[PDB]
Amino acid sequence: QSRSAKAGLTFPVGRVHRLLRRGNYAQRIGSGAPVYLTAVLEYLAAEILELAGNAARDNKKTRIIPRHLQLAIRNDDELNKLLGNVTIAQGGVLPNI
Amino acid sequence: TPSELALYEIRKYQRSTDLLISKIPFARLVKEVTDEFTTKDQDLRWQSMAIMALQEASEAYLVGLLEHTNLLALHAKRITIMKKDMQLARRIRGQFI
Amino acid sequence: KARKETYSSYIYKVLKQTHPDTGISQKSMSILNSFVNDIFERIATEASKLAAYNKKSTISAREIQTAVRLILPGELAKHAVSEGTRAVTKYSSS
Amino acid sequence: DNIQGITKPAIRRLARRGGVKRISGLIYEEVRAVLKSFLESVIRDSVTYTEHAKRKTVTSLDVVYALKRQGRTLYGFGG
């Protein structure tokens, strides 16, 4: 049984564990840190994916393009604060009045 | 002449390097602020050097913002500073976003 | 001839769980991969610096929670710490 | 009730230090507002820092660490 199914998370647990253990971050690594980081990353990914899907469905589209991601990013205050200095390739600028 | 006294006091305040805000009101304000962010079942104390460092940083930021808004007001072919000038300065600064 | 690992299958499964009928492109997948990698790197370095501040040598859940609270905004961190604590208490049930 | 500790003499002195020859009547309110916002941000960061270490006293180390993490490094107070 994988550790991801034990905690009920879709994102992997051992992979990120090895990533943060081989990243020269500390001498030792706890036991509750990888699952916590996996849950946080999964929540963020699910939120951004739901926003992108809603933005794509609003334009009666069947696929997600970087324009929808840029719109979903610029249409949220918290996502804009987290990604203020980050640009999206092939996203463009948002219209304004 | 008012302009002579204005330039004289500007030079006098630019030559000095000490603080220009009282310590007790700033301490009371920072205490109220740190109490607003802290629950009621506990209270946080404050040292002496931390308040001084925070006050120094605040005065530096305020002097920078005032210089920027003064340049912005001088760009508009006038001397008197307005609220819209400081608004546009804080908007184009890109910080807090 | 050397294969690499990406967060493609997991992101696709999360999207399928969220929206039943919605596709995606390679550009959006690469963007999401870069975003999640940058977030993971930021949280990791923040936790490492926080552990080095207190003369510590371990990375427990408390450091990661504090790094998440310090990096993410108000409501985002409020939901993230709740999800993390839920996952921790679910995994600890052995 | 407590934000009034920044009365217009101090703001005028700061403006004279910044090189201002004329100040309007609607500048003090916005100065107080931006000062309160900056204070709230820095104090939230410092409180988080001092609460992570399980302490009830805020030191200058947490303040300078929060200032460095925000993007405004401060020299002269150690750390």
């Binding site: 739901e50 205050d77 | 804080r90 908007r91 807090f96 976003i97 | 939901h79 | 507002a33």
Partner: peptide, 21 residues
């Protein structure tokens, strides 16, 4: 089967001292 829970607000103009209300 997964829906968002956190509140969503439009980007606020911080330069105009806007509040979340």
């Amino acid at each position: 089967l997964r829906k968002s829970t956190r509140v969503k607000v439009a980007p606020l103009q911080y330069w105009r001292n806007e509040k979340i209300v």
